[PDB]
From a paper:
The NE1406 gene of Nitrosomonas europaea, an obligate chemolithoautotroph, encodes a protein with a molecular weight of 40.1 kDa (residues 1–356) and a calculated isoelectric point of 5.0. NE1406 adopts a lipocalin-like fold with domain duplication.
The C-terminal domain (residues 221–352) is arranged perpendicular to the long axis of the N-terminal barrel and comprises ten β-strands. In fact, only one of the β-­barrel domains of NE1406 harbors a small glycerol molecule from the crystallization solution as a ligand. We therefore propose that this region, which encompasses the calycin signature, acts as a ligand-binding site, the shape and accessibility of which may change with natural ligands. The two barrels are stabilized in a perpendicular orientation with respect to each other. The mainly aromatic and hydrophobic residues implicated in the interaction with CHES are highly or strictly conserved among DUF2006 homologs, suggesting that the domain interface plays a functional role. As with the glycerol molecule bound within the N-terminal barrel, the CHES molecule is also fully enclosed within NE1406 with no exposure to solvent, suggesting some flexibility at the interdomain interface to accommodate ligands.
Author numbering: 24 to 74, 83 to 351
The structure:
Amino acid sequence: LAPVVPGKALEFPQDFGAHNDFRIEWWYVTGWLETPTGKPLGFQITFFRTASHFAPDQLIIAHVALSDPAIGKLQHDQKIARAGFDLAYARTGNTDVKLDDWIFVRETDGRYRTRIEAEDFTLTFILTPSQPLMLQGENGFSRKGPGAPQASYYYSEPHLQVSGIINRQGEDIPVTGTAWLDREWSSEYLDPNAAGWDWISANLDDGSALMAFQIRGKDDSKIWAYAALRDASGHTRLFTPDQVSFHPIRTWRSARTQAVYPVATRVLTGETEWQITPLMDDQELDSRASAGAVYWEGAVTFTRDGQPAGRGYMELTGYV
């Protein structure tokens, strides 16, 4: 029901909780891990809600992945449930999100705990904030297209410290890491002339946080674009669509879907050039059989004007 309009200030801790009066809501976690041997792994977790004893009226959709270069492709799992019916089974509420056993919870102290038991791995993590949260756009009002209604309320928690345990092959391993949380809600999806989006975020080594995206038209026009850099002084610089562009360095073709992705790319935010290198090429996640789509969810490293800068994720949609 509820529209996204400017001049509405976010308030915390209230706006950590679900926004069940809106049509759509996202909880998106991306990060890098380190095992006891020093080996890196990437992971991501998505929950997405959109709006009777069996009828699919309100829905919670989720997917998870682990990126291990030793495997060379994702290990992933994906689920969807009807929400509103059995809050014990599937719900988005004041402190958590739950789909079957998959759960994501915010503690009173601000720490996130999550247990995600998938087919080939389990993630049991604590994600501990280290910085103030980062409002996107204009104090959380973040535009995603030229139309007046084409906007989201949107913030991020960058530089989440990761602790906890991954189970794989029935073997518990403790990990450390750093992660990023996006929180977005709206009553309108992207314009349907959009083929898809490209999104990146980066936990930069100096403490800075970067997020950017573009919306791709089916005609290969740039429907919209955005970026925000919060520097080590805590100042956020915002970039207009004019100032953000994407420039592939290298493409990879999926043998599963035949889609062709810019897995390595250069992203310009004003006069600053960020280069994105993938941990591995095949980070494609096909969730179509759980009412999803084919996404590239890949852990990537960033350089800035040619120097090492940090680590993060890149998500690419609408390439099939």
